[PDB]
Structure formats: structure tokens, C-alpha cells
Symmetry: C3
């Protein structure tokens, strides 16, 4: 009676030993990507290229050559894009807006307050900070309302959202550098910008103050945004300083996702799980490619290897058989894990025991499937956006992401160490029972050598052997 051995050099670790050589193994740690940024469940990412979401939505001219898909599953944005607010300013609840737009089932720009209908006001206001070909220009999607021939009548504009979808609408307030600038632009001095819906009520006043120049400008534009419900109306009214929308964005979501910081470009592959380094195609329970994934991914883990033993100890244990009283394995056996040798005056040979091998194999298959398929895997974004005044909130997020990282790493490491010493012991027991099963038949008619062999007292031809390996014999 003996056990299998081969040319393998695959090493695993158990709870009691390490660097233990086994005959076969399974790695349950995915660590390879494809290097490519891909579609996610068949739907592409929004490719911003060199733009920020602000620049894109406002219509920074340097963002004219963007692709713009009707639908996307996540957003590729560079870390520190180049083209954002060409006209220096700020964007209120910018991060909230990014989350909103992270994943969109349908997205269509539509004209809601046409530039031309602003008669009684100058409409061509631009600036060289938004220059296209030396010439002054402006956010393609916004209108800079300024005095007309020395007069700025109350500006009123409204829009009933009849597009049949929620609509994202953005507006701005211009903050002059000094009182003089305020006048040459708007005539009036104590101005206001007023925005209303069923939900939104807001009246801003310009904050005229002295500031350092950004892109050569001391003035600023502060943008705000809102979701106009279906069949609801938005009302703009202003005595000056209103930067009005010309367009709105029909938006229907969906499921919500996240933004991926990367320099690379979309490549036309598929994936259910994307990382900033490349896409992951795996059934394995854990990965260590990169923490900031998007999609349905394995548990990220701080391990370098998680190798599960599946075969037995390779010898060229709890039950004292394998590498025990049966000193070594048989390379000559290839039909299975456990089996017989048998020496006869009709010839020698190695014959695997198909029934106990098959059972052991079913068990190990079940173990590996348990460790792999009990793992619940849902869609997550991981990489989140936080402002400069949200350092506590950002850290709460980190402490949380790190918290799970440690839980999964420790558990996966130990699950593998514990399950490996069980597996080797399992093989040991399988052999010990095969030996005992044969011993309990032969009894007296054989001398138990002690090396796992039985020397027959009587002659045992090829017909007699088969009975022993069968369970027949007598």
C-alpha cells in the first residue's frame, strides 16, 4: 500500500509547517490584469481625457473635442486635469455632483434658455482666460449677461422641464474684483441672482473683493447646480451678475458608480471588474492587483500568495501513514492518489485504487468550491471623492477600507493555513484507511511487514490480487 508522488515542486504552508512540497495545488489569489481599461458590463466609461467634470459640463472650450456617450458605467478623469474652470472660480457641492454623474443610464444635453432670447441684455461677454485662438470666448454652455448700452433691466428666464426626464441645470454668480468693474458690467450696484423650483430657493449676492490673479483674473465665478424634476419649473431672476445656463442635461440613472483616476485610454475589451492598472477576469475569491477597483471584484487583500494544497505531501501526519510507516510515494503510479503495488510470479505493477481516489478527488473539489463560491461579490466603486474641508470624512472612509482589508487578509491567510493542514491530514487518513481495509481482510494469511506491504503465505495470482483490491478475498 502506497501513495502518489511526482515531479512537482509547488510549495504550500500549513499551520504547523511551511515550505511544504505537495503533488498539486490551487492558487486562490488573482494577481493578473490585462493592462487595458475596458467597457464595464458592455457599457463604456465616460472619457474626460484632459478635462475635469466642471470643464465638461460648463463647456470650457478646451473640452470641445470630447466624445460624449449617451450612456456610461464609470468616468475616467486624470488626477489633476488641465482644463477645468478656465475662468477662475468654484463649484458648489462639486463632489456630490461627481457621484451623481459617476454612472448614467441616459445623458443628453438640451437647449433650455436660448442665448438669442436675452434681448435687452448683452450676451457676447467673453474673456481671454477662456480663449479659443487668441480671441476671448467663454464656457460654451453658459451665457454671460451684461449691461446693454448702459442698461441692465431685471433678467427673467424660466423653463418647464418637459423633456420627460430629470434635468441637471447649472448656473453661476460672477464676483467682480472692484466696485468699478461691477458697474461697467452691470450698471447697478446692489444686485442679486435668484433661482427657484418646487424644491430650490436661493438668492445670491455678489461678493466683490480683492484677490490674487488666477489665469490673470482677480474676479471669480461661483457655480451651483440642481436637479429639476420632471414637469417642474426653474425660475431665474437677476439685477446683475447672473451667469445663466443655455443648456440643461437630461439625466436618467441607474445605479451609481465612481470615478477612476488614470492617464490611459479606453481600449475595447470587456470586463466585470476594472482597476487603474487593467481589467480583471477571474473566479478567484481574492486579488491583490489594486485597491481602487470598479465593478464586481474579489476581496482585495494584502497577501502575496494564497496557495491551497489539493494534492498530498510529495515524498520521494496525524494518521502516521504518508511519510510515516509508508516511508515514501510511488512515482510509478499515475492512475490516482492511492493504490497498490503487488508482487506476483506473473509480473509486477502499480494499480491505483479508483474508488478511494475518486472519493478523495470529489472531497477536495468540494473544499475548493466551498472556499471560492461562498464568496459574495457585489458592485462597488471603492475610490471616493472628498473636498479639502472633508479630511475627517475622507479618513473615516480610509479607516473603513483599511478595516476590511485587515479582516479579509487575516482570515484568508488563516483559512488557507488551516484548510491546508486539514487537506494533507485528509490524504493521510485516506491512505491509512486503505491500508487498514486491506489488513482487516488478509489477517493470518499474510505477514505484515510494517512498511505498508503484505507478504503472502500462500500464492496469490492475478485473480487473487483483484479480490484483495476489490474487497472480495477469503
Amino acid at each position: 500500500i502506497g501513495y502518489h508522488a511526482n515531479n512537482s515542486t509547488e510549495k504550500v504552508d500549513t499551520i504547523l509547517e511551511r515550505n511544504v512540497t505537495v503533488t498539486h495545488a490551487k492558487d486562490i489569489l488573482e494577481k493578473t490584469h490585462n493592462g487595458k481599461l475596458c467597457k464595464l458590463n458592455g457599457i463604456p466609461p465616460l472619457e474626460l481625457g484632459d478635462c475635469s467634470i466642471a470643464g465638461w459640463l460648463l463647456g470650457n472650450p478646451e473640452c470641445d473635442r470630447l466624445l460624449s456617450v449617451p450612456e456610461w458605467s464609470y468616468i475616467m478623469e486624470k488626477e489633476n486635469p488641465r482644463d477645468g474652470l478656465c475662468y477662475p472660480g468654484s463649484f458648489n457641492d462639486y463632489e456630490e455632483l461627481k457621484h451623481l454623474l459617476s454612472s448614467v443610464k441616459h445623458f443628453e444635453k438640451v437647449k433650455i434658455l436660448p442665448k438669442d432670447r436675452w434681448t435687452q441684455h448683452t450676451t457676447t461677454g467673453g474673456s481671454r482666460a477662456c480663449a479659443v485662438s487668441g480671441n476671448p470666448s467663454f464656457f460654451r454652455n453658459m451665457v454671460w449677461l451684461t449691461e446693454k448700452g448702459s442698461n441692465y433691466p431685471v433678467a427673467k428666464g424660466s423653463y418647464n422641464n418637459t423633456s420627460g426626464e430629470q434635468m441637471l441645470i447649472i448656473w453661476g454668480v460672477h464676483h467682480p474684483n472692484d466696485e468699478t468693474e461691477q458697474r461697467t458690467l452691470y450698471q447697478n450696484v446692489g444686485t442679486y441672482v435668484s433661482v427657484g423650483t418646487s424644491t430650490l430657493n436661493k438668492r445670491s449676492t455678489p461678493d466683490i473683493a480683492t484677490r490674487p490673479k488666477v489665469n490673470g483674473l482677480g474676479s471669480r465665478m461661483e457655480f451651483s447646480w440642481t436637479l429639476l424634476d420632471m414637469w417642474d419649473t426653474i425660475n431665474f431672476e437677476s439685477t446683475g451678475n447672473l451667469i445663466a445656463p443655455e443648456y440643461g442635461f437630461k439625466i436618467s440613472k441607474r445605479g451609481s458608480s465612481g470615478i477612476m483616476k488614470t492617464e490611459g485610454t479606453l481600449e475595447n475589451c470587456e470586463t466585470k471588474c476594472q482597476t487603474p492598472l487593467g481589467a480583471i477576469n477571474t473566479t478567484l475569491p481574492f486579488h491583490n492587483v489594486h485597491p481602487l477597483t470598479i465593478g464586481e471584484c474579489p476581496k482585495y487583500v494584502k497577501s502575496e500568495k494564497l496557495v491551497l494544497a489539493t494534492g498530498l505531501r510529495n515524498v520521494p501526519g496525524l494518521f502516521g501513514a504518508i511519510a510515516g510507516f509508508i516511508e515514501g510515494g510511488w512515482q510509478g503510479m499515475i492512475d490516482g492518489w492511492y493504490g497498490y503495488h503487488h508482487s506476483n510470479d506473473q509480473g509486477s505493477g502499480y494499480a491505483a485504487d479508483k474508488e478511494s481516489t475518486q472519493k478523495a478527488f470529489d472531497g477536495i473539489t468540494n473544499k475548493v468550491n466551498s472556499v471560492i463560491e461562498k464568496m459574495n461579490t457585489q458592485f462597488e466603486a471603492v475610490g471616493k471623492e472628498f473636498s479639502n474641508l472633508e479630511r475627517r470624512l475622507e479618513n473615516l472612509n480610509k479607516k473603513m477600507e483599511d478595516g476590511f482589508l485587515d479582516v479579509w487578509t487575516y482570515n484568508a491567510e488563516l483559512l488557507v493555513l488551516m484548510e491546508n493542514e486539514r487537506t494533507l491530514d485528509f490524504h493521510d487518513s485516506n491512505v491509512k484507511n486503505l491500508y487498514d481495509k486491506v489488513r482487516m481482510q488478509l489477517r493470518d494469511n499474510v505477514k505484515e511487514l510494517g512498511n505498508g506491504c503484505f507478504e503472502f503465505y500462500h500464492k496469490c495470482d492475478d485473480e487473487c490480487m483483484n479480490s484483495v483490491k476489490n474487497g472480495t478475498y477469503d
Copy 2:
């Protein structure tokens, strides 16, 4: 004459899973997953929930007239609110830090409405302002708890009102600012045009100005009322001052908490049962470590888990393993044995029978009882609310909460599933070992005086009466005899 070592079997069809096998039939099992509720919404630790019925918390606190018929308890342990109540801000508006206020009120040790700035004392101002958006019987009315200060006969003198909190408890006080639809409305209501509303305490400093703008009509109104709130400490004073547009409180709410809880979205009503753990589907009464009833629980509950079954094997493999005994060289089990898990058969010229081995059965039973108790009682279970409130501009914060709740869900589910799979293969193996040792314990006594058949039976060479058997099952036995030999 012969004696046989064996193990219990029964009519059971209960199946469990191990790490190596599945759908394995065992003689007894324990389900450690609670999945039944009582369908009722109950008191929580003896204290009722606040039943809002068709109202929102805003509607309730402000005194929306459609909320007149609410119960109002002095004390509650959580709040039942519908998803999308019907009666909130009858006069269209907003409520600042509304969600924070809901959390504050989620659980309250004592709650009493008290009159702090009596409506009548506002002489020099009109006080009867109402609106048909808050209509009670066609007629115009208003939030029962608030006062709409308006011009009196073409005059709106500065309005001053203060209150020293002498109630001996923190007091929740709410006020509002009215945002007219146009400048004309502003005048016919308040005369003055550049108005303000000013509120102060030792802690709060706020001056609002009305935002007069054009808006779509909600409940037929283009105007809006924006409410704010604060906690007035004990022995501290609140000062209101305004040249117009103040919607002043008439009442305040004595509030003493407590512990903080949460709000439950449901359509159902309180039913007068008890529970330590409430779900939107019904209450849970269990000692089990895990449940799968519903994620949004309130109280002290089992770990919610995405499993369908978590069955722990306690008995042995039902046969009608690591140690090669059970369903091994002892091919099957004995249905005829009912005194225990392991035991003897024995064939005598005085009769046959089955006799369980009380000492090894009792030990095995104590071990399995300890295993099950370990898995169950090591589970730490504290009071939590789970269901949280987030505003429209708090989608990131809400998602952080979800990612967190989902994070633990996966941890517990994976661990519970595997803990059960691992512990089950140990249990079956444990029984196997128990039998193997009982067999070996008998073999090592008899030695020569018996032929080891190989099926777990021993055929005696000498005769072994009922007195001889007892010695073998005792551990006595010996042996001088001998015969045979002969």
C-alpha cells in the same frame, strides 16, 4: 457467541453540508439561522414606538392640522414613519438639518410640549395669519404650533420675544422665515421691505433675510417657509427679534434623551407585543447567532446574513470518514439502538439485544452541546438602529454607510457559511473517532479469546454469558479462559 460495537441510526432525513461533502444525512441537527418573525410591530424593551401614522416629523412638530389626531407618548424607543408620508409641510418650504433632527428624536426618554411664547402676548402685531394650504374645513389655518406675525393695521414694529428655559430640561425650539413670492406680497404682509429675522442663545447666533423670488406653485403657493431649529440648554435664554417675516414658535418641546435609536419605514401599526429586536416585517424572538429576516432592524439583533440555511450537525452520520469506522469497516448503523449514539449488539445463548454505551454517548453529547454553545454564545449582540436618514446632498455619506453595512454583511456571511462547513466535517469526524475508539477499547481487552470478524464484531472462542458481556462493556473482562485454544 459474539459481541458487536456499533452506532445509532434513526428515521431522520435532516441534511447538512460539510467542507468535503454535501447533502449529508445526520441523526440530529441544530439550525443556527433565525428566519421567523411574528409579523407584528411591537414595543421595544417595554417602551412603545412613536406612531406618526400619515405624518412626517416636520408636520408633527410644526403642528400641521392634518396631524391633530396623533397619539403622542411621553416616551418612545423608535419612530414609525411611512415612506413618503402625506402630511408634512402643508405650507411649502424646507427644514434645515432635518435629518439631524430626526436622529435626535429617534429615541426619547421624556418629551413634553410646553408653551413658551404665548400667541396672545404679540400685541402690536397681527397673529391670525393662516392659509388655505393648511386648511381645516375649507377655512384657512396654519401650523398649530407656530405663529405667523404680520403687519397690524399698516404697521410692523420690531418684534421681540425671549424665553428663559426654566423647564429643567433641554428644550427643542423651532422657528421659520417666510419667503414671499414678490416685493408686493412682502409689503401687504410686513409693510417694511429690508427685513430680517434674528435668533440668539449662548450658542446660536443667526440673522436670516427673506429670499424674495419667483417659484412654481406647490399646494398653490409660490411662497415658502424655511424652518430652523435649536436645542436650548437648561437655564439658557433664546431671543427672537425681527422687522418682518418671522414665523415664531408658540411652543417648545422639553426633551430628555437617553440613548438614540432610529426611524422605521412601515405602513403597519403598533400591536402590543414585546420584543428586543424589531424588523419592518415583524419582531424577532431568538437566541440564535444569525438571522435573514430583514436588514433594517432596530434593537439587539443577530448578525444579519445572506444565507438561506445554516444547519449545524450535532448527531452522527445516518447510515442504515477520517477514522474509517462509521460507514467504513462498520458498514451501517443500527435503527434498533435508541439509548444513545454508540453501543453494542452482542449475541448470546441467553438472547440478543442492543445496548448503548452510556459513558461515551454522554461524553460525545456533552462535547457537541459545548460546540453548539460556543458558536452561539460567543456572539456579541448590541443595540443598533441600522436604518439611517440622509439628505439629497448627502449621497456620498449615504453610500459610505451602505458600503459599510454591505462590508460587514459579506464578512459575516462568508464566515458563518464556512464556520458551519468546517465545524460540520469536524463533528462527523468526531463521531467517527468516538466509534473507532470504542471498538479499539473492546478489541484491546479480548485479544486472543476472540476472532476479529472485520465488520466490527467479535466472535467469542469461549462462551460469554450475560455476566461476561457486562464485563466487556464495563471495561472489566479477563481473560484467563482459555479455552480456547481448546
Copy 3:
């Protein structure tokens, strides 16, 4: 010759999954529960000791905070729960909690004068108040300037500063909210005033909120402070027609790594640690601790356990494999060379001789088990104790629910890991003995009578050479 196992005077108890209060020959506690009682340096760098002050009081320069130490560098902040000296002049501080997090850990911190008090000619500059009194006399936040009318005139106040210090600079300013319109005038002449602050990033125009309030420290007025980080080479511009409480100083700040604040009454003591708690410092390699939840540094997983004892030796007898406390009824106190071994009775003498090879292997295995449980534990720098405002009760609870969530995960897992690993360990020893017995039996065979107690009685004579 016999086969048996070790026993000793030990009374150390462990629990397994099947039994409890089981006595073993040796054990290892993997739960750290001792501190040194001292508050210490953290990785060689001291904490900022605020003593009786709040961070506001410190930064603004509340006079009652004059005698503070002030280090150029610190790894965390000691602040009392409810300090005594904060805003002596009643008010508020905007995004205060965010500011505390910013300052929790600082690589370099230097106060520098950016808008000298003297250069405010055309304005009165000596404004004080008895709420900030130093020796009866009125005083004011040492780091701030109270700009007031000069002889009945308050010209537009302009002051700017280009950040040339070569480091980000934390700058703080305030707006004074008078009690009534009259106070506004006797302080600033003008009535419709504003305070305006600008940088490349910050744009803000505040107006004073004149209203009636209860007195705090005898004052109905209030000062509302705000703050900003002025980037390197960027400029900040102040402009105001009144009510501006201007900075005289700014704080060069370079961080670092970010940490947290520790609420405590104690004082720094000049010890070292990698892990500090409010009760004392922890020096351990153990995977879990139960000293205190609010730690700072690199600490073991906090856990709700009272004991986590790992069995390492075998069952102490004065199992799965039926040997230990089985057919070999008890252990030998007379054996001291190892865990398993032989007795042997000879006509040349008796004795106990441990089996060095199987003992050494078992010992290597158990050493590996204990090392696995301990060294697989990933331990990173965390702060745990966080600051939340009165209007952040939801956010604070999200943090608690999270901290409690992991506490339960680790506690349950550590408890069960120990229970499961202990029944494996005892069984491991059992198997080791069973195999040593079988290894000897399979040699002797016929030449000996197997007694059944783990001994073999030789048929032939077996001298010391035969043994």
C-alpha cells in the same frame, strides 16, 4: 519498555470547542491587557500638550494659554475633555473639527508674524475686553487684532500677505457680532459693514449679525472665527469697513501623516511607545488587546474578550486518537526532557527517556502555529478617537457603528480561532503519542506482549543496548 507523555505542576486552564476549563502543561496568552500607566512619546515624537486649553484658545492666543510648551513637531494632541480656556470672548469657530484633524499631527509648526499690529495706523488697535482679562485689566487674544474706529473714523481697512515662508500657512480671522446698533457705531462708526477675505482659492464676504443674546462671560456680543490654508507663494487679502478681527500671526504648517486627539487629564512622561491609550502605553507583539478602545499608533486589534489563551502543551493528566488520557491512562511527571518518550524496565535499572525527535518536531509545529496566529496580523497606524460637532450626530454614529462592527468581528473570530486551534493542538499531541506507540509496536511484533496500557513486556531479555 513503555510509552507515555509529559505532566507537570501546571494549573493553567484553556478552553476548546468541545470542552472547557481544560488543564494543559503549557500555554500562551495572545491577549495583551497591560499598559504602563504613562502617556508617552509616539515613535520618538512628543504629543502637543494643551493642558487646560482648547485648540481654539491656543491658536487665537487666549491669554490664559500663555504658559504652553509649543513644540515644533508632534505626533498627537493631548486635550482635556471640556478644557477651561477656549474662546474667552464668546463666539464660535467655523469647521472647528476639521481644523483639529488638520493639526492632530504636524511635521513642522512655526508661528510667524504676517500682519504686524503697528502697521494698522488710521485704526485703533488696542481694543480689549475684561472677558480676556490678564490681571484685572482688559486684554485680548494675543494673536489677534481688534480693529476699531480711530477718533470717530473707520477708513476701509486693507491688509494682505504673500506667503513667502516656503510652507503652507494656516491663517485665522474673525468677525465681531455686536449686541445692538449703538455698540456697532461706538466701535466702528459705519453701520452697513463687511469683512472680506480672498486668496486663489478662498472667496468670502461676511456681514455682522447684530442681535440680542444672553450673556456669556458677561458679553452679549460674539466673535465668529474662520480659517484657511494659504498655499505657498499665494496671497491673502483682507478688506473691511468694520468688524474685522484680523490676524497678526500665521502658522507655518507642514504635514505629514495626520493622527488624532487624545482626551486625558494626565501629562507627558518621557517614555517611548508605538501605541498609546488614554490609560497608558502598550508594548506588545500580541495580536489582540483589551486595554482601551481609543488608541493612537500601531496597535493590536481591540477585542471584547477577557482572556484568549492558546494551548501549546498537552493535556495535563495526573481524545481523537485515544492515546493521551486514553489507553495510556496518565502522564509521567518523572519525564522532563520532552513531551513524549519511554520508560523501560530493565535488570540493569529503570528510567525515563524522552524521545528527542518527535518532541522536537511537535515543538516546531506548535511554534509555527503560534507564530501564524500572531504574525499574520496586519497592524497599521490609526487614531480611533474622532471629533464630531453637535450637528454631526449621524456622522458620529456612523463612526461608532463602524468601530463596533469591527469590534464584534475581531472578538468573535479571535474567540473561535482560539477554541478551534486549541482542540486541534490537544488532538495533535494525542496523534503524536499514538504514532510513537504504533511506531514501536510495529517493530517488536511477536517478541512482546502488548499489555494494553502502552507498555510492552519483552519475551526475551532486553539490555540497555537493546532498548
